[PDB]
Design a protein around this ligand. Structure first.
Ligand SMILES: *CC(=O)COP(=O)(O)O
Ligand SMILES: *CC(=O)COP(=O)(O)O
Lengths: 249, 249
């Protein structure tokens, strides 16, 4: 049987106090009656507002990024700082960060390791580019990204790890991976985890799909045996995030 | 006569809710009786706490960094987002950001321009490295950084601009620039602004010194004719920030 599903909202760099208050009320009023971990990741400056207004018992609050240690890092937010204000989830290795803000496989793996050490639940993002997929390098790429992370983790740290398979070509492009495309990658990821980390770890591991998930395509994606939920960008800013949660029933 | 001084606290990536509540109480209880703009720049996640607790009428709250536009920028905080939550000051071009997070002269100038367009007061950071100073390139460097910013600004936008001369070698090193060293650079900066932007702009422009400022060295720095206050790192996390404010009397 599948482990507990996750429906995660990456709001990215979006929102006003008014829009967030309205959307959070929508999320609060949506009564969820199955076992699912909902996650909302607002911008750093919006974290306290969401903490103050979000009351739905199925939800936790996540950061969109973090650095490992406090200190002389102007503009950045550290893991101890998040922990202190009551945020113990974090998204790491998200694609535009990897691509434009210099987060290499090594850097992402290090961040994931430090977050686990500091008691975070981590949504670690992996995924191939359009060119990588065309060159039939999808498996090589996601396994390389996963193994980099794994190399810095103890077996027991995996209880805190959630993988998000998010092909770069599906992010905000209106071109969702098909259920067959997504399942194929989830299956190979779980096999690798089973063989390299443990059969027990593999059985409990949530592997989420991300990239153009919406209310209409979510259920058929979730029907696949190795998809454990979603990392949602655009649609998570809208009332249809309710439908995506319910698609994990 | 000197324009209104500024005493600005860059807390960098530091603080807990408990430490911030204590330090803000210290700042609140310190009664300031001269004309000065105090500025506190906490981490993004701490902005609402500081907004809720800081009451000293001489203070405004600043962001430590921002990007210009909202959108698909995981982990980042935009200028419209800050404006909406009531933050209309921002520090830009701070040294570790220039050096490690890829913020070139062009990128910093663009950020400053967008912040001004969005109605921000901007503390724009400039300054030479140790090697640059040894090679007698200080003037060339700070003028190049300043001119890059100036090229993207209308004359009227300068009413929103505060320059912070912050030599890289003086940041957190316990090696403050001497009053003579700082004044020499402030004088040449103001001359450039006078000649290139306008005599009126130059007279009103706040040029702050940053780099190992503390309670003991602040007054003698402020005594120099072209120093208009301070951008303070380490000492701004301590009760002695009160003394630094009072050193602008
Ligand atoms: C995971 C992610 O970045 C999704 O973005 P979307 O707008 O394609 O859902
Ligand atoms: C401006 C700045 O980064 C100062 O740091 P400090 O700890 O040297 O004051």
């Amino acid at each position: 049987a599948k482990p507990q599903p996750i429906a995660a909202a990456n709001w990215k760099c979006n929102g006003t106090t008014a829009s967030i208050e309205k959307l959070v009320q929508v999320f609060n009023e949506h009564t969820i009656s199955h076992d699912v971990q909902c996650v909302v990741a607002p911008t750093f400056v919006h974290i306290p507002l969401v903490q103050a207004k979000l009351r739905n018992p199925k939800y936790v609050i996540s950061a969109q990024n973090a650095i490992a240690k406090s200190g002389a890092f102007t503009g950045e937010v550290s893991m101890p700082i998040l922990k202190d204000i009551g945020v113990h989830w974090v998204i790491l290795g998200h694609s535009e960060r990897r691509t434009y803000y210099g987060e290499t496989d090594e850097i992402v793996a290090q961040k994931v390791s430090e977050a686990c050490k500091q008691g975070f639940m981590v949504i670690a993002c992996i995924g191939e580019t359009l060119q990588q997929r065309e060159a039939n390098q999808t498996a090589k790429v996601v396994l390389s990204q996963t193994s980099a992370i794994a190399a810095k983790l103890t077996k027991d740290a995996w209880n805190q790890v959630v993988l998000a398979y998010e092909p770069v070509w599906a992010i905000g492009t209106g071109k969702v991976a098909t259920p067959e495309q997504a399942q194929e990658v989830h299956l190979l990821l779980r096999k690798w985890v089973s063989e390299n980390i443990g059969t027990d770890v593999a059985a409990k591991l949530r592997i989420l799909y991300g990239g153009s998930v919406n209310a209409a395509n979510a259920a058929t994606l979730y029907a696949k045996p190795d998809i454990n939920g979603f990392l949602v960008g655009g649609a998570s800013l809208k009332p249809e995030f309710r439908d995506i949660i319910d698609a994990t029933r």
